[PDB]
Amino acid sequence: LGSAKQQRAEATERVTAGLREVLAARERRAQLEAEGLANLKTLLKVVAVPATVAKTLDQARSAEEIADQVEILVDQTEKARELDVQAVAWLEHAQRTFETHPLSAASGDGPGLLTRQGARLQALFDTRR
Amino acid sequence: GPLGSAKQQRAEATERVTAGLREVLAARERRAQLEAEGLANLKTLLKVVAVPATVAKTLDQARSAEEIADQVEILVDQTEKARELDVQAVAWLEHAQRTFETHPLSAASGDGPGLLTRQGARLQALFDTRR
């Protein structure tokens, strides 16, 4: 309505104000997300945190990084369950071996090397964890 | 001859004593050597099934069956403690998934699936408390 010159002045002003509006929103979003990340960590800590990830949890700079630490923990738990399987298998074999070997087996003179550890061993063996 | 035959008697008496010691010694030595063989073969038998690094690192070096037993107990210790950690980690992972699913920063929005979604399978696997 105003002028040839004033028409232009409003037209660009829409562009610059629109930019300011965009930047303002991004800024506000960053800081609330920072608050959200802070509070995410607080929530995650309500249940005891494995030392594995606790060592690094506070340092995570985003939710994505925490998810990564989660994925690490999952991998590690998978690998540990794999080793358990192997360890029980070897322990079963080792106990069998010891029980029939002249160097270890119980004799007339008392118990074998693994005797006093038998109960504990059987627990590990009995079909769980 | 007189001196000679007398001397050969002393020599024989001397040898009987030396032979007696040698006899006793040889028995001790042979027992040691056979127990050594036994320890070697014990390790060979033990290796027929894959040996955890806990025990494998030191097994060949073990000076007796007793040392191997010590290490066995360690392995048992480690396996106990590991099973304790499994319990704790599953507990936390459950809590973690529960939390991620309802949190604005991670939960699925209009723009796609949540952050942990792609881990759903593995997570559920671990959760269905096998092993």
- Between the CA of residue B116 and those of A16, B83, B100, B105, what are the distances in Å? 39, 24, 7, 12
In degrees, to the nearest 5, what angle opens at C-alpha B107 toward C-alphas B111 and A21?
55
Å between B103 CA and nearest CA of chain A: 8
- B25 in A contact zone (CB under 8 Å): no
Residue type, A4: A
- This structure was determined by X-ray
Give the helix/strand (H/E) hosting B22. helix B2-46
Q: What is the resolution of this structure in A?
A: 2.6
- Long-range contacts of range B3-12, CB-CB < 8 Å, 24 or more positions apart? none
A91/B76 touch (CB, cutoff 8 Å), yes or no: yes
Residue type, B99: T
DSSP 8-state assignment for residue A48? P
Per the structure block, which two tokens stand in for A43? Answer: 């929530």
Beta bridge pairs of residue B115: none
